[PDB]
Every structure is written in structure tokens, then in C-alpha cells.
Design a protein around this ligand. Structure first.
Ligand SMILES: Clc1ncnc2ccsc12
Ligand SMILES: [Cl-]
Ligand SMILES: [Cl-]
Ligand SMILES: [Cl-]
Ligand SMILES: [Cl-]
Ligand SMILES: [Cl-]
Ligand SMILES: [Mg+2]
Length: 348
């Protein structure tokens, strides 16, 4: 067991191993209560997250367990990983607090899209890295569900990592009105059309790729219905085949109230873009999720010929998510979480 020391960080008591020094608050609270520190064992600048009220309800205890399981699994160059997890508790009986340690992220994609001039070469390398990380995530039967520029960390060398695993499901209020939290969402999940699957993430990558090419949000809707109208004007209204797959009768009735529209010519929308970029966007932004390109298929597209290496695009170890359908008490979720804290092995 390391030695711990205590300090008050803006009306919060932090108790952490001596290896972590020079703690100071960071971020806009998007990933929880997070400080920056220097890790003296590894020489890296790190983010230390202290969870708020991790065991206060069954819902919160299960969310804590879910976040720790997901972060312990993810071992890939293009995905956030866990550097450490600790508790000052010396037994299950005194366990209350959980702390997670990751690499400190400086800038996200929004900063570079907003403030930098990007070459077709920059767009190739950024989207190649997102798809490489997604091929890995999807091989474990994990759906990200929230890919957007603020969840993509980017460094000076244009190297990228994917963020946001096992945090609270987004509320209907967070999704209301003129908000970036909805602009990257696939239509079948935005409007609850049907049981969704991993194909939702490829819609999101299409929306991100279009914005890197134009410097503008692709579907900046003022509300759910305005955003659906922007989507159908580009990709066309649904045919009988997709309408059959909308399980919700009222959602089917609403769609049929709209005048039919054809798919637009993407070369006249993305004026001057690399024809290979236009071709890939047409294969991602397909209304029927069964027909969209997969991450593994997209890596082999000619747009990525300069970066694609099929011997260096790895898949994940198997991920057991059977706990997700399990009904347990608060103390049972707390015991499962304690075992995952004490069994952690740090990366090489
Ligand atoms: Cl990205 C992400 N998802 C869930 N928890 C954390 C803690 C630090 S970064 C992070
Ligand atoms: Cl230490
Ligand atoms: Cl990492
Ligand atoms: Cl504790
Ligand atoms: Cl964003
Ligand atoms: Cl597993
Ligand atoms: Mg999110």
C-alpha cells in the first residue's frame, strides 16, 4: 500500500498516493471532479478524477461499476486508457471513495476545427484514427453513442484519442434545442425509431468528417424536428423498406406526413472536396443503419491508402457485459467495484 496525503481542493478533501504531486483543478466538469497532477512514477502529466457519491443509489453504484469495467478494458493507441485506480480505504468496510487516473488531455477537436486551416491530408489522418479506435471498440460489442468533437482529444502531432465511457445516460433536457449534444446523433436514436446498434457511431463519424471538410456543423438543428428536416433534405426521405423497420407506429405516421424528397448530389454540397472523401461520406450518411459502411470496411476505403496497414489495426479482447442485465443491491455493486479496484494491474 502506498503512503497517502490529504489536501482540500476547493471545499473537497482529496487523499492520494505521494506519487501524485502539484494537484490543481482542470476542465469544465464534463467528465466529473478532475484535477491535473504530475505522476512522479511515470513522468506523465495526468488527470485525477474523484467520483461524487459513487454508491448513493442502486443506479449510481451500477454506473460506478460500469465506468471502472469499461476503462479497465480499453487498451488501444486511439482510445482513453486507465493509468491507475485507487482508494484510501484499507478494507471493504471503510470503502467510500474511488479515484481514476488518465493521461491529461490538453485540446479537443473543436479547438483545431474552429481555429486551424486543415489540408485533405489532416482530414485523412484524423478520421483514419477515429475509425481505427472504433474498429477496436466495436470488436468488443461496445457502442460509444456520444461521438462528437468535444469527446476527441488531439495533440500537437495530430494524434487522436476517443473519450466518454460509462458516464450517466444523457437526459432529454441536455438534448433539447440548439445544442451540440444532439447534432451528431443518428436519426434512429434521436427519435427512438427502433432498437439501435453499433451503426449509430458511423453516422456520427460522417457528421464529424463533413465539419472538418467545410468548417461548419452538418446538421445544426434548432430542435429534434428541425434537425430531422435538415437530415432528410440531404439523404432523402425513407422508402418502404426502411419504414417497415420503424417499430414505433406514431414515428412511422409522422414520417409519412412529409413530402417525398430525393437524396442530394454530395459533390454539389461538399464543393471542391477530394472525390474519395465525397464517396466515403455517401457510404457513412445512409438513413437505413443496416446499409451503412462498418469501421473495418471504411479502413480499407481508398481515401485512407496512405495510412491503412491491415497488420496494425488491432481488435479487442472479449468483453463480458452480462452484469448489465443483472439485478443487485447497493452493497453487492459496491463489493464488485472494490474487487476491481484491488485487482488493477498498471500498464507496462
Ligand atoms: Cl473519457 C472518460 N470516460 C469516463 N471516465 C473518465 C475519467 C477520466 S476521462 C474519462
Ligand atoms: Cl506513492
Ligand atoms: Cl491513454
Ligand atoms: Cl474511501
Ligand atoms: Cl462537440
Ligand atoms: Cl471481460
Ligand atoms: Mg456523453
Amino acid at each position: 500500500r502506498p503512503t497517502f496525503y490529504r489536501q482540500e481542493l476547493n471545499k473537497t478533501i482529496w487523499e492520494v498516493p505521494e506519487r501524485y504531486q502539484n494537484l490543481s483543478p482542470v476542465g469544465s466538469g464534463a467528465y466529473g471532479s478532475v484535477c491535473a497532477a504530475f505522476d512522479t512514477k511515470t513522468g506523465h502529466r495526468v488527470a485525477v478524477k474523484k467520483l461524487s457519491r459513487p454508491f448513493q443509489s442502486i443506479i449510481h453504484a451500477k454506473r460506478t461499476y460500469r465506468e471502472l469495467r469499461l476503462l479497465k478494458h480499453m487498451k488501444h493507441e486511439n482510445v482513453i486508457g486507465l493509468l491507475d485506480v485507487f482508494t484510501p480505504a484499507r478494507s471493504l468496510e471503510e470503502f467510500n471513495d474511488v479515484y481514476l487516473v488518465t493521461h491529461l488531455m490538453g485540446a479537443d477537436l473543436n479547438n483545431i476545427v474552429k481555429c486551424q486551416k486543415l489540408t485533405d491530408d489532416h482530414v485523412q489522418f484524423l478520421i483514419y484514427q477515429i475509425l481505427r479506435g472504433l474498429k477496436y471498440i466495436h470488436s468488443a460489442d461496445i457502442i460509444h453513442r456520444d461521438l462528437k468533437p468535444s469527446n476527441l482529444a488531439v495533440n500537437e502531432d495530430c494524434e487522436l484519442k476517443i473519450l466518454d465511457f460509462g458516464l450517466a445516460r444523457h437526459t432529454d433536457d441536455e438534448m433539447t434545442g440548439y445544442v451540440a449534444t444532439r447534432w451528431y446523433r443518428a436519426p434512429e436514436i434521436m427519435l427512438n425509431w427502433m432498437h439501435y446498434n453499433q451503426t449509430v457511431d458511423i453516422w456520427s463519424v460522417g457528421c464529424i468528417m463533413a465539419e472538418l471538410l467545410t468548417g461548419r456543423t452538418l446538421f445544426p438543428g434548432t430542435d429534434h424536428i428541425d434537425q430531422l428536416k435538415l437530415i432528410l433534405r440531404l439523404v432523402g426521405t425513407p422508402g418502404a423498406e426502411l419504414l417497415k423497420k420503424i417499430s414505433s407506429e406514431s414515428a412511422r405516421n409522422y414520417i409519412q406526413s412529409l413530402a417525398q424528397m430525393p437524396k442530394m448530389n454530395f459533390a454539389n454540397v461538399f464543393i471542391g472536396a477530394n472525390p474519395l472523401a465525397v464517396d466515403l461520406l455517401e457510404k457513412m450518411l445512409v438513413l437505413d443503419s443496416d446499409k451503412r459502411i462498418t469501421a473495418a470496411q471504411a479502413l480499407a476505403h481508398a481515401y485512407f491508402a496512405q495510412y491503412h496497414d491491415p497488420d496494425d489495426e488491432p481488435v479487442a479482447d472479449p468483453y463480458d457485459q452480462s452484469f448489465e442485465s443483472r439485478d443487485l443491491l447497493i452493497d453487492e455493486w459496491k463489493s464488485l467495484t472494490y474487487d476491481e479496484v484491488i485487482s488493477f494491474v498498471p500498464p507496462p
